[PDB]
């Protein structure tokens, strides 16, 4: 239930100085944090969709859950990424 | 790193662990792939503050634990990094 450790590690490496190192257990920690992030947002969206008797978690439900939970700054880059992904 | 490389099937599998998730739209995993890249990058940068504050150049799990305590947006990781 985790994203591939090499992808997580590549994103981490791009964030720190080129000379820095990342311990294996820190890559594994971030791997777990990512999965919890996805589950945390999904839980918020899924409760809302249930309250509204809707059977599909849509993109707006994920974005709204992110906005509610402190990640409103993600909404605009995600919309742009999705639009560009589909164009 | 290109966000398109993240496996959408794995993101969907994680979402599907939720007890109230029935169907998921096609776009939801795509949005989470980009969100994952933003989240990892910000968390790593915030942990690296503590790496350097401790006069180290290796990012360690304790640095991530400290970063989580210093940003409200990471409050939800309280049990993941104890």
């Amino acid at each position: 239930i985790y994203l591939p450790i090499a992808n997580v590690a590549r994103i981490m490496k791009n964030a720190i100085p080129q000379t820095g190192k990342i311990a294996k257990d820190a890559k594994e920690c971030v791997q777990e944090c990512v999965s919890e992030f996805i589950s945390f947002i999904t839980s918020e969206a899924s409760e809302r969709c249930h309250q509204e008797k809707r059977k599909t978690i849509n993109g707006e439900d994920i974005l709204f859950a992110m906005s509610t939970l402190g990640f409103d700054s993600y909404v605009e880059p995600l919309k742009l990424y999705l639009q560009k992904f589909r164009e | 790193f290109r966000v398109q490389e993240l496996p959408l099937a794995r993101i969907k599998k994680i979402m599907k662990l939720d007890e109230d998730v029935k169907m998921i739209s096609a776009e939801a995993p795509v949005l989470f792939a980009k969100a994952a890249q933003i989240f990892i990058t910000e968390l790593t940068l915030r942990a690296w503050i503590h790496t350097e504050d401790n006069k180290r150049r290796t990012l360690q799990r304790n640095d991530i634990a400290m970063a989580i305590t210093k940003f409200d947006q990471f409050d939800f990781l309280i049990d993941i990094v104890p």
Binding site: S39, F40, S43, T68, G70 | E19, D72, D75, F76, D79
Partner: peptide, 13 residues
């Protein structure tokens, strides 16, 4: 902002 969702996620985990 996250507190109620955290309490809930703990039961799910």
């Amino acid at each position: 902002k996250q507190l109620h969702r955290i309490l809930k996620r703990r039961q799910a985990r």
